[PDB]
Symmetry: D3
Subunit: 232 residues, 6 copies
């Protein structure tokens, strides 16, 4: 067990899907995994392991923000032998061209966090996903006929930013979506030699429960299917 | 309701105790409060409201890290009329003398996060607690015969930091404890015109992560929570 | 002696009041102290030691700006065995409800100087006063019937800042007063293991551009010094 | 014409291969292109335009470093309707398991330049390539029996860095190769709404001090240009 | 022979003039220099060595940008026994009284590049020219009956800056011209114990963007070179 | 009168010499000036006006540190029509070739202060002196048969730096002397359109840490003042 995870080596698969919401992880395990058992409940951060089309797969919330997910992903990679992390969350759009409910894949993630600067001697570290995983997600999305843009995310430290101007800058530089974890996860993946990817669904443009349901399931399918592609 | 809290004005007291652990909020609610009603369960971030010695009080987790706690503290202040946040958590010690199960009070909080620089034109904002709230906790501690030290906390962005030397730096300038939230909560409070305080038990020394028995953990915890609640009553006077 | 103080160990009390102006220090020694003797005149930065109600106490100017006061406070702490430093000066107010002649006590001190980032590996160091010193001042002030607000100061590097917008930032985040030394002095105290407090009187309002008259100055000045001295004796208990 | 390119709209294709060396640009037009008409020679920065397997294609030097290549790529995009830009150059390796003559594709580019900060309010802009162009190059490399590693480059401002420690950091975070332009190119691409890509061949190993020979240089170089050209075709389909 | 210069010790005089343009360096060798011999052409960065009034003197391009010229000037100093570097280029003016085609001598050079911060522990290094070299350029200029303005240059990383507002800042602080190298060359000069100077002719107005003829650009260019060459002779005395 | 200078227009010459020590300003006025009159004594910062070889000249302390001198130089320039400031103080050497009592002239001034970044949009401002004033100083030193080196000073915020390693960096990049004002003064000169120059005598080594008599300290001190006064007469050409 780790300081934040009450489980033993083997309890997780070598690939973990991670929403921000513990309850989202719960719904994923119950909806897409088979014979899914609970493996973590410390701090209510619900973690489950099961199988998807024969493939052993884990899902577990990571909570909100870079420092929260940095703890969880780190402990998974170093003490649970996890190799691939796929964050599956939502984000805000700044580009008018980006439609509500669109699926975005962050090959990169900008940030206003300082954690990568602390890692990289206060220089510019390009927080990037694993290309193979990005590819797998793009293919899996086509096989499902779902349109998915591939580009930069922006990982915010402040959900409620005192600087509205920054949004004009993100837009000028083509940021697909604004969330709060990607850049941080990519940093941890680089620090501890694993691989990761963030996939999001535009929950709103920052500028009903019906659609919001399947649109979520699309993303999960893409994530799950993409693992199978990577398995080949 | 707010995006992260499913409740309505009045569901919260004007004061909120906040541990990082939602489960710790549930324990506090059940252990110390009367007639506790759960008021939020969004993202599993449990919040409760009840009374302590006649006083209406709330307790709710804030999650780990400045960004997490910054969301909840903000929403409570803007949409739930909260006037006071008391963070109740645990920290790792850097100073040789600070004893385990010593209660540290963060009148100030250092940090390596960038959020206050973003707020303060990239100058040095001193993230501080409300002075009166600090005195109230100091006073409650003395009444309860509990050793409390007042000074600087340090709020880390990285629980697993690659910069090990920083702890020597923290030690040199007298940082009392390391956690991951204080400086962000103080930021929100200043930005949004509220008052805040962080109190922490000492869970270990950062160098030489000792083992801690369940008993001494629960015992020192209970003392912290009592200082929190009592200091509120003092402030009410 | 030190490069900037021509004196011997023991020529200073373990507590030193410090105005920025040496002439104010002179005035303090002759007006409030008994048997005051001059202990320094290097660079005309006059220093004195005498007694107040049977208590050995010193007073000495620190000059203007963090670099200047950083020198004297350091030398006092390391080479004269000084344990406590109380800065007494004036500040400009950025908040409307902070009134001319108000007494402000800086539990924290913001800054745009780089000295603390130099000490603290370029992270956010919360430049804080010593808590007991703060409470001593608050109490000593209540006893004297004088109102005092406790919060953040802002220590500026440039008296004539090219950045007018910054004041609006200070006001948004609740800065009580603008001066030029506290954060620096707090930094020295953290670095060399001593205790510091900064007390200011509002000598003008950056918004209304109002200034204190000749007579108003002395009135509030004596109140400030009285709160300083009468906070030491509380500390001695 | 632009201030650094004495050509006119039409002279370039919508795709431009760009080595640092102008002579290497000359070499490409002569060896891999047909009907190669020189379109520029200002400051000796040779630029050409021929065709490859029927596809209209340009090739031009960008000079050494971010500032240099920022000028050219900017003018190409905004004044010559260029849509894609593929850099082709050599890089140093810090990873042990990255061997000489390797083909690294930078989907990301780290840097110690300040240009992206100036662009991005001093926050962290992740300088990235266009994804399609990245896959196009990976696929073309497969079709030619080459294993192209995708990941981060480091774009240095100083070929002769005074900070030897930095190479360890690059290695620690998996930087595939060290060059001097990728990050700035990706920067211009985003600023002006264009697609860019950087392909590099490991010409030496910073650690072991090995360096490719004259022949290995020309061999791998050709393979690189081949992948570069072929990839463009894949993108057209 | 170095990575970017194909030549051996002695092939360069101990003083080198450097335009940004290789072709400008060629023009100089063939026009001002006697017995001019090409000593480099790697990457097309043409380098020459000949004599001026009996004095051995070299002239070579340095390309555009701090990173580009940092390579060449560095390699000249440590591998070719170069003692003096004189940059000879053009700059854009921000000040009103700085006239088109005026000759500006960079006694200091500001920059928005991070290279000196990387050298100087993230503090402010004043990137300055060598005094005597400056005096020599001033005197030699008076002899030629040419007015030269001595002051600050600004070395930009971006020729196409996203921050127009910055030029207003340069104007306010008395920046005589905006180029792209001076600060890097002074950086290298200080790092490796050499002496450097940048001279520039005002090519245009950042402000009025009027225009100049080739024939008058030529006149000014020659004045700059004559001043450069003559200043060397003054130094030898 | 200004907030820190109790005098009226005309009381000061258009050139003001300024040591850090007010008592040093008093000594200069008594020793070199004729018909010297005190024109300021606020905060004990004595200022004087008189004549030297028939030339009207002022001398006044500026205190210790960039923040203190910035206040005085600004007020003198904007409210007393002062056009030229000549700092005359002491510094520490880091270079072996810089011997005790050497006279160094700061053509440039590095710094770890943030004041110039606040001014210059967080870019590198090359804090420079007026060239003519520098040359005037060099020449007046020649005629007086005194050795004076021209180069970079370094203006420190902390006389007691927690970063001892920075002194190695100062040496590596040729810093002639270490003081606490030059960069600030030059920043003011540039901001308010005046001209400044800092001259220093080497008072000690941060290397060997030796000192001299009270006899030769004054000897070379007078030499510095002579160079500064004579340099003004030269500038009257």
């Amino acid at each position: 067990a780790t300081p934040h995870i009450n489980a033993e080596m083997g309890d997780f698969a070598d690939v973990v899907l991670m929403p921000g919401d513990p309850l989202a992880a719960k719904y994923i395990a119950e909806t897409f995994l088979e014979d899914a058992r609970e493996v973590n409940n410390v701090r209510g951060m619900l973690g489950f392991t099961g199988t998807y089309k024969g493939r052993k797969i884990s899902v577990m919330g990571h909570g909100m923000g870079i420092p929260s997910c940095s703890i969880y992903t780190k402990e998974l990679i170093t003490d649970f032998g996890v190799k691939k992390i796929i964050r599956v969350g939502s984000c805000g759009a700044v580009l008018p061209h980006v439609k509500l409910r669109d699926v975005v894949i962050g090959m990169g993630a900008c940030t206003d966090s300082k954690v990568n600067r602390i890692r990289f001697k206060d220089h510019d570290f390009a927080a990037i996903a694993d290309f193979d995983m990005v590819r797998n997600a793009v293919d899996a999305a086509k096989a499902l006929g779902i349109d998915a843009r591939v580009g930069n995310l922006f990982s915010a430290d402040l959900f409620y930013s005192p600087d509205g101007e920054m949004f004009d800058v993100m837009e000028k530089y083509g940021i697909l979506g604004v969330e709060m974890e990607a850049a941080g996860i990519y940093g941890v993946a680089a620090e501890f030699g694993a691989k990761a990817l963030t996939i999001c669904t535009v929950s709103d443009h920052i500028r009903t429960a019906a659609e919001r349901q399947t649109t979520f399931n699309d993303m999960i399918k893409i994530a799950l299917e993409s693992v199978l592609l990577g398995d080949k």
